[PDB]
Amino acid sequence: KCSNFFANHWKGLVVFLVPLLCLPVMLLNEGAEFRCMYLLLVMAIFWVTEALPLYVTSMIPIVAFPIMGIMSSDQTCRLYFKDTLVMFMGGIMVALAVEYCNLHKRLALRVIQIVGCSPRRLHFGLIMVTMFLSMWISNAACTAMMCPIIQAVLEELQAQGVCKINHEPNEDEPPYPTKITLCYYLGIAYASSLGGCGTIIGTATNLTFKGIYEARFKNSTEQMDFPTFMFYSVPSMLVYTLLTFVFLQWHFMGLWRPKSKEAQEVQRGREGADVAKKVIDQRYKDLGPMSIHEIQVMILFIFMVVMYFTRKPGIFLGWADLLNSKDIRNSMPTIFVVVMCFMLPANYAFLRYCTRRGGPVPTGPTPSLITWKFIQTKVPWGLVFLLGGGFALAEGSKQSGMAKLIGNALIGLKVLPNSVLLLVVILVAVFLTAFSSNVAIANIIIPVLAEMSLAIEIHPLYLILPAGLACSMAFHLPVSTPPNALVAGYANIRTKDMAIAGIGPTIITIITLFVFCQTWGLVVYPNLNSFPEWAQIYAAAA
Amino acid sequence: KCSNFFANHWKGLVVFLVPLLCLPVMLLNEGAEFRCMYLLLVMAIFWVTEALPLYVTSMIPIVAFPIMGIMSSDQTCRLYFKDTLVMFMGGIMVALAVEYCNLHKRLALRVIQIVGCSPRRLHFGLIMVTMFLSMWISNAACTAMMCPIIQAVLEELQAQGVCKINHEPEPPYPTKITLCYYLGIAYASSLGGCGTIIGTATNLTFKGIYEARFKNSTEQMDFPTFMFYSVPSMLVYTLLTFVFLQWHFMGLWRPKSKEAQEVQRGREGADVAKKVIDQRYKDLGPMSIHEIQVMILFIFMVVMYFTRKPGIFLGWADLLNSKDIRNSMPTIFVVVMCFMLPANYAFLRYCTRRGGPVPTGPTPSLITWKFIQTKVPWGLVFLLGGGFALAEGSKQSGMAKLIGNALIGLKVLPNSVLLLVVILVAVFLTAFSSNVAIANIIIPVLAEMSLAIEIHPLYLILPAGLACSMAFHLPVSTPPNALVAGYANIRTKDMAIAGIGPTIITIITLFVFCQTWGLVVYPNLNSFPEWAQIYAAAA
Ligand SMILES: CCCCCCCCCCCCCCCCCCCC(=O)O[C@H](COC(=O)CCCCCCCCCCCCCC)COP(=O)(O)OCCN
Ligand SMILES: CCCCCCCCCCCCCCCCCCCC(=O)O[C@H](COC(=O)CCCCCCCCCCCCCC)COP(=O)(O)OCCN
Ligand SMILES: O=S(=O)(O)c1cc(N=C=S)ccc1/C=C/c1ccc(N=C=S)cc1S(=O)(=O)O
């Protein structure tokens, strides 16, 4: 057993040894919750270390749950491929439809002309636009929307000679992305996650903990209206985004290190702006006027986004409330657009048969907006298992009883002083959300915090708001949040790079949430520090 | 001009014009039954005419049902990706694992070696091996695997001068021997597909529909019982098909047909040529531990399939009795084990017995994810799920009862003539379109009609479900036919003439073995069972 043996063969050692070492967890304790804990622990070690492919590791619960007796085999498979998963896959398909024509190149060339063709400036603009867009739309939709634009921008910069997308070349193993590509893709993913926290309709986590608070505490003086939540949350969101942008510049592009070879590259790229402006303008003119194919794709995309926005906005009715015979969710418009792409034609030259006294006749079947061959090749189909694993694991945790075990576990924190309690609550929320779905963590932690707040005589919002915002802060692993998985799949990003890079945003968001809550929340809700009367009534009743 | 536009642009006309033309059905009638019927009619016309891609057409229910009153968005999406579909996808992945590392080549060449080398014995060996392989793999995959071997043998035979691939002199016309070999391979693929549930998708479709419609039925189509029902008839008509082709092209029973002389030249000489080329082409190397491990995993998976719920003893799924397991943990277990296990075990030189060069990098596994992602057909998810979802919506909306009441008049006809008519109609419909589409269209209608009359549902569903897989006349009928017609430049007229034999043989064989052997496998097909009475009364 030389050291070289470990250097070469450590993945197999992990796969062989970890289950045997983790066996005592279930052997010592009787309940089924400990079986679920064992399975979760082994899956977590496989995710962090990446001994197996991620997609294969996500296939374990199908085998594991029926054997352990947690839940039946038919139910487990149905837990995959739920409504939200269909929405995600449809979004990826629509993005490929956009890429099939050259609309993404047109949009990229337009943006470069406005920005000024500087690598540092473009990155800032794309992050800000992504955050503003994600304030009103689901995060995965924004990430899928924005990925091809980033790809086109990187190709243009490479064409001008500024940078390289991939390192110069186990022939199967895909190319390793460069520092700048990592910076851009991680930037758009993090920007989606950070900008989501802005408004009440930005993401489902906000709606979840809002609903829990409203249900548990009616007759509450303080209220989470649409304007008030935004007024509370926006400044912190701005500070997150700017500080995260600065950190990303420092980590990957050598912002404050002039000697570093990273900075010299950006300096040489910026040196050539004057001629690059004419080059970009000429290359844009080289593209012809927008064809009908592009216009049709663009109209379909705008229609999809508008239908996304107007469903139960909360400030007016929307189309969901008109149709109340059955529940309708966001999967409907997406698949509608996917089908409509296959129905419509790319050209209308066949109309020359009946009009314009004839003309050049196609002499062939007319292509549609997209082809199935392009979809079957480009879509990453492993994401089905990776995303469905989260739903399956969450439902298994709920069925087994491990969630109640965790909720009982948090109760012991009552002894701590107030500020230390707030900090520990934020840390616990971040750690738990690292490995699981955001909504599940909110569901398990929030009611405990409400009850514990009533017990110890402090205002419930004081703990509820920071934790609810904290559940969204997931940056380390691809399995933490759908944007991470999407960007990892689109451009092959190894887990180690993401885990190392994610350190900055975590510290930044924790510190800034702590400070702005403790100070600015007092301004927005003046009675936060003190204990109100209606809280006393509920405490006495309970 | 006028005809040419229709010739080029008929698919767009269908797609545009069918929904508007079928709209009055929904407009004039008030019930939800008619909305479901309108959706069914449009989807059926799209599947038959191929106006829109099959996988894309299958996605319509997700949009259509929630907008109407049928079902919610969550429920419709759950209808996709059931247990059986996961079993089928895992089986495809395991078959890919077998294809990787070239085990099928070993089995095929070894069996051909064991059987004779003369042209007739070579034909017999090719047909039998193709049938056996197609029992567990997709049909087109088996055809693609098997064609190169006969191509090489034919090339060498032509080079020697013992036989000619083509007529002497707009592609060249293949001769009778080439037609015999290639058509035999395609037909063998199609016939052997029917033997097993995982052999072809149509089996999964009709089994899943039957299980969904009648959850209380006491007769079950589990993996072993289906095999018991299907295998003997498969062997009988495979043998009869082989005998038919030999008479049609090689003059088997005609002593001097001017076709037996070619075979006599083949048996006199070039037997050694074929033997040498096949023996040399079997130079894969010694059997390796990688292949052995894959083989053991496959055998273990099948053994787990048989011992789920046997009548003789308990077995698993009874020792683990808290929840249902249902033939889905073995398949995914094998798939994961393929990624866990190494392929060399040469790294054990490090510990002791250092007899050779040690590895300098990570050791590969039995398979890679890149191979899986590029080879698996992922549209089957949408196609199969769409079939299941349409069936379930038909059940819930209430349109199923309306169709059954309409077909009550067929009660006067005797049971045997009804079975024959069902088989004939299934074959005729299959002639022009996809097998899975036809199964989706016709199986639920048969189930409801069976409830209306006093007939056991299996009695009609099994023969029709198997008949949906019998397609030989045209390239459009099934992908193996198209692949074979592409390889050897087969004109349509010859294929249509040659396919007459298998049609009659399979029809007669199904007609006889159903009525006789099914009663041995299912003793209660002649009677009307109690649970059927309960279902009919409730409906
Ligand atoms: C009530 C119902 C209960 C049901 C229970 C079901 C349990 C199922 C789950 C089982 C979990 C464990 C599975 C382990 C599989 C074998 C893993 C072997 C890994 C291996 O050999 O790695 C090498 C080093 O091994 C070493 O150094 C390890 C020592 C040698 C191990 C030899 C293993 C093979 C021989 C035995 C096979 C059977 C094992 C038991 C099933 C280096 O490999 P690498 O990293 O270079 O390349 C890896 C390419 N993937
Ligand atoms: C309670 C009420 C419920 C109502 C329910 C209604 C349900 C409606 C369902 C959808 C119906 C509309 C379908 C829209 C797409 C039509 C696609 C036509 C394709 C086309 O032009 O085909 C060409 C010939 O067209 C022709 O010769 C025909 C004329 C084509 C005109 C094109 C018009 C485009 C805009 C249509 C808007 C429709 C809005 C909805 C009415 C030849 O094509 P090919 O074979 O060469 O290529 C094939 C690949 N494409
Ligand atoms: O988590 S739960 O399975 O309990 C769940 C129940 C619901 N009940 C109802 S209606 C609705 C949603 C829901 C889970 C949603 C997600 C679960 C995991 C995600 N990412 C990962 S990994 C993202 C979402 S998201 O769609 O909310 O963004």
From Swiss-Prot, chain A:
In adults, abundantly expressed in the fat body, basolateral region of midgut cells and oenocytes. Low level expression is seen in the halteres, procardia, restricted regions of the esophagus and hindgut, base of the legs and in a subset of cells in the third segment of the antennae. The keyword Thylakoid does not apply. The chain crosses the membrane at residues 12-32, 51-71, 84-104, 122-142, 182-202, 228-248, 287-307, 331-351, 415-435, 467-487, 498-518. Keywords: Cell membrane, Membrane, Transmembrane, Transmembrane helix, Transport. Induction: Completely inhibited by DIDS. Modest but significant inhibition by phloretin or furosemide. One of its GO terms (molecular function) is pyruvate transmembrane transporter activity. It is a multi-pass membrane protein. GO terms for biological process: citrate transport; determination of adult lifespan; pyruvate transport; regulation of triglyceride storage; succinate transport; transmembrane transport. One of its GO terms (cellular component) is basolateral plasma membrane. Cation-independent electroneutral transporter (not associated with membrane depolarization) of a variety of tricarboxylic and dicarboxylic acid-cycle intermediates. There is also small, but detectable, transport of monocarboxylics. Transport is through the epithelium of the gut and across the plasma membranes of organs involved in intermediary metabolism and storage. Affinity for substrates is citrate > succinate > pyruvate. Fumarate, a-ketoglutarate, and glutarate are also transported, but not lactate. Transport mechanism that is not coupled to Na(+), K(+), or Cl(-). Belongs to the SLC13A/DASS transporter (TC 2.A.47) family. NADC subfamily. The life-extending effect of mutations is likely caused by an alteration in energy balance caused by a decrease in transport function. This is Protein I'm not dead yet. It comes from Drosophila melanogaster (Fruit fly). The lineage of its organism: Eukaryota, Metazoa, Ecdysozoa, Arthropoda, Hexapoda.
